[PDB]
Symmetry: D2
Subunit: 213 residues, 4 copies
């Protein structure tokens, strides 16, 4: 647990909890989002709750701005070294056609841009771990949800032979503790990071007890 940890949706909920979780674990986290108001908030807390932490890297950014987002990340790669972890924890953004195109762009294209950038870096490293946090209208939501899965699926198979691992975590509801707690997703990741170097888990599906029956 020594290199950088890029985390989208880092200023809120799950992204924030995992950011503070890996920072405590030793990684140097890169907090991506927009609010150089909400991020710093995560920055200050992290380092105000730890005896010793590498200190978070506040990178205000709109990942939907693909070109810029790619520049920002590369720059961060030039200054602070290798990237060991990428956690896609950004919340999903749910005339008809125009809206569907817009939902695909923000939820899938942008994500693809980030993976594209971070994957080039990791392959040069022959190592790295990618974590995807999912969830679970004439098909808008479904098409978008599967688009991300199929993307994860493809990367899983082609990045494995190169030492890079991909795991998508699919929980039902998470924030009332009748749901899946954010710490559950964080601890499952710590477990993942600690498995044998040759072990690959495609994904893990988290279901709420109440939802089962």
């Amino acid at each position: 647990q020594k290199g950088l940890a890029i985390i989208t949706g880092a200023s809120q909920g799950i992204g924030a909890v995992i950011a503070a979780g890996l920072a405590t674990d030793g990684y140097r986290v890169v907090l991506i989002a927009r609010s150089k108001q909400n991020l710093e908030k995560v920055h200050d807390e992290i380092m105000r709750s730890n005896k010793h932490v590498q200190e978070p890297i506040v990178l205000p950014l709109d990942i939907t701005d693909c070109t810029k987002a790619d520049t920002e990340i590369k720059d961060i790669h030039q200054k602070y070294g290798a990237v060991d972890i990428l956690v896609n924890a950004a919340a999903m953004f749910m005339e008809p056609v125009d809206n569907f195109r817009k939902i695909m762009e923000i939820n899938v294209i942008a994500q693809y841009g980030i993976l594209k950038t971070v994957t080039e870096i990791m392959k040069v490293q022959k190592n790295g771990y990618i974590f995807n946090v999912a969830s679970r209208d004439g098909g808008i939501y479904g098409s978008t949800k599967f688009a991300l899965l199929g993307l994860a699926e493809s990367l899983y198979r082609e990045l494995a032979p190169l030492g890079i691992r991909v795991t998508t975590l699919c929980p039902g509801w998470v924030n009332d503790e009748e749901m899946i707690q954010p710490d559950d997703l964080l601890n499952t990741i710590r477990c993942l990071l600690n498995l044998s170097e040759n072990v690959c888990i495609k994904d893990i599906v988290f279901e709420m007890k109440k939802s089962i029956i």
Copy 2:
């Protein structure tokens, strides 16, 4: 009485086969593809091969232009009546990846969404209809993302349209023996692949099932593939 059967990618391969077949069965097929010229040929072949068939409607169209697609199809519906079937048989399309990824999503997913929205609007009003989807390697995940997005779309509509009386079935064949197969990178002999008629006859079987039977999808596999 058999109404309209709209087929996309109707000028070549699987589409041309299913279109010619449904026309023979008695539907008035609407042939959609970019080339007016190549569509007229499928149209010609049909008239020629059938004694009594409703003349296919040649609709040169780029489904990417969802606005034009909606207008044209609704005009056809107003003029010819009920739309019984939609067969999405358009071929899968595949300087900068991110923009390339967008064009691939737009052409394969966004466009089909447009056609599906138009047609389902018509079918929802009729409280009847059958939608068939014909589906079919690294690259940073572009191919799989696109494919899964179509299935996710299909999955959602299957559930949403069921109660309205509209059925949806996605057909997933491995390599299919059409000219498009040879021009693609097919390493198998004609015989070894899934045949075009297999898909058409499966669609024929689906159309004949009782009204309340729903089959989300049928996966077609090559003996050869299983062997290997």
Copy 3:
């Protein structure tokens, strides 16, 4: 290619009875398997009344749990009538044993549904393996896990024979319908109207469609859902 023998289990009623009838009308010489000789004969007589010129159905009074007697009878018919083109496993699901110990009920349930099925399969597949051709069709349908386990065991069996038999020219397809409109549905007290359910003919017509696909086309399974079930 002349049409040969078509063996149907659970042929005296329900879905099996309907498929057997249709296959007889299609030209196959059907072998009706079930325990009731009386009821098998009624099916035999009904088919002949529907069409007197059809190949005459072979009535085979059998308890398929008697794997040895099943093997013997089936093989004699193969010796007698030739090539076995089709096997349809449509015997109903025996789901309940009135006994004290559940572990014992689980044994009996597994014996009657999986081991028995395995037996029939073993006999017919070795016949088809010699022929290098044939088509096998399976009709699927707080237990403490007893039901679910028996159901998957059957699916697990089908899935492996699918891969195992494909290269031998033998195809396997499992049909998984929700409620089907037959007398057995009535016997099971279905809460649905007849038309609301999947009709028997849909399974029969789907089997007919599979039999006409090109020889190299393999479809492991087809799932049938009732509009209502989805609407619910």
Copy 4:
């Protein structure tokens, strides 16, 4: 307080590694298998391997003998109390007809029997966790699916009762049960042990039906 942790296939391989792991963690583990002496080994290793540990109960038992198994498990429950965990790590025992019948008895009928007994107990406690470790004519395939259908069935049947179930489906794991091709860089038994560790620590309302472990190698 941590109660009993029942482990089948505890005398060797994965079950062995899982048993010693849970012992070190705090549970009083019941070691089930046929070889008494081998169960003893695990017992003593665990003993000498930890400064302090609840002493493992050695239970020489052929779970094939259902009635005896149920009895033996009830005594331990009577005598020692609550059952927190049940780890089915027993190996897959593999006229063909009668042979298939035997394979089902040993692998599925027997396991059902164990689950029945343990489930009854956890039912009352309203708490508990069950962990499953997963030209033939379809025998192996059938058996494997049978076990899965059972686990899937219980998964949603026990969830509302406060009892969780998770099936761990690994590929090749490096245990000496290596009768039969990879170079000691398969799945390590510790990976399964640690995964179970993680699952035990998740919120009590989170449910994970199964986890598929693959070899970076197997994905060519």
